[PDB]
Amino acid sequence: RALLEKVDPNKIYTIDEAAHLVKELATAKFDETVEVHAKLGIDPRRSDQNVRGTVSLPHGLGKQVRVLAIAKGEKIKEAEEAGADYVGGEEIIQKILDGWMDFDAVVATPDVMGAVGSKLGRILGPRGLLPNPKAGTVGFNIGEIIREIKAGRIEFRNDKTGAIHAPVGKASFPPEKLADNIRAFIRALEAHKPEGAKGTFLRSVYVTTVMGPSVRINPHS
């Protein structure tokens, strides 16, 4: 844990330095999702300054992503038709508990999320693989969700604190690809600067994981 002192909390790192720090400190036990969090120069209580859109990450998305869709009843067939690599009903949960992890991403319909969250929270959670409606990975339009990932896009939306975050890779990625993905998210955010927002837009930007320290980065590096 003392390992924490490898990250200087006051330094503004380059994106490449941050990518390397990610890989130096990543737990070896499982593959963690790497996020970028930014504090935005917006008023989060006014809808005309909402920031919402997609990032087309240059690495790790598209046809190659093995998507698991968990659904129920009719939506199983829709997930199959949309080309999810793996589809299951709630019966698939036990298979995951038994050690099946061939998938890279999980999406789900709302009706299975109680069971998914309760049984797989402690497994998918620490890995960053838990579906969430705010990330656009839980919904009844399961086919559209699958197609968006296969088209190489991830969704983002600011929160009520005026911050925003999105996954940009895994700790297992080569650092150059992680760095590429971090830059891509920053460029996607900048392309979505609202008209009317004043002052600095990217006030601070960080590379993060759920369980680890944040690494502050220069978004123009």
Curated annotation (Swiss-Prot):
SUPFAM superfamilies from the UniProt entry? Ribosomal protein L1
Organism of this sequence: Thermus thermophilus
- Give the record's family classification: Belongs to the universal ribosomal protein uL1 family.
Pfam families (alphabetical): Ribosomal_L1 (PF00687)
Gene Ontology cellular component list: large ribosomal subunit
Upper classification of the organism: Bacteria, Thermotogati, Deinococcota, Deinococci, Thermales
Its GO biological process annotations read: regulation of translation; translation
UniProt-recorded Gene Ontology molecular function terms: rRNA binding; structural constituent of ribosome; tRNA binding
Protein function: The L1 stalk is quite mobile in the ribosome, and is involved in E site tRNA release. Binds directly to 23S rRNA. Protein L1 is also a translational repressor protein, it controls the translation of the L11 operon by binding to its mRNA.
What keywords are annotated for this sequence in UniProt?
A: Repressor, Ribonucleoprotein, Ribosomal protein, RNA-binding, rRNA-binding, Translation regulation, tRNA-binding
Describe its assembly: Part of the 50S ribosomal subunit.
UniProt-recorded name of the protein: Large ribosomal subunit protein uL1
The cross-references to InterPro entries, in alphabetical order and at most eight, read:
Ribosom_uL1_bac-type, Ribosomal_uL1, Ribosomal_uL1-like, Ribosomal_uL1/biogenesis, Ribosomal_uL1_3-a/b-sand, Ribosomal_uL1_CS
Give the matching PROSITE patterns.
RIBOSOMAL_L1
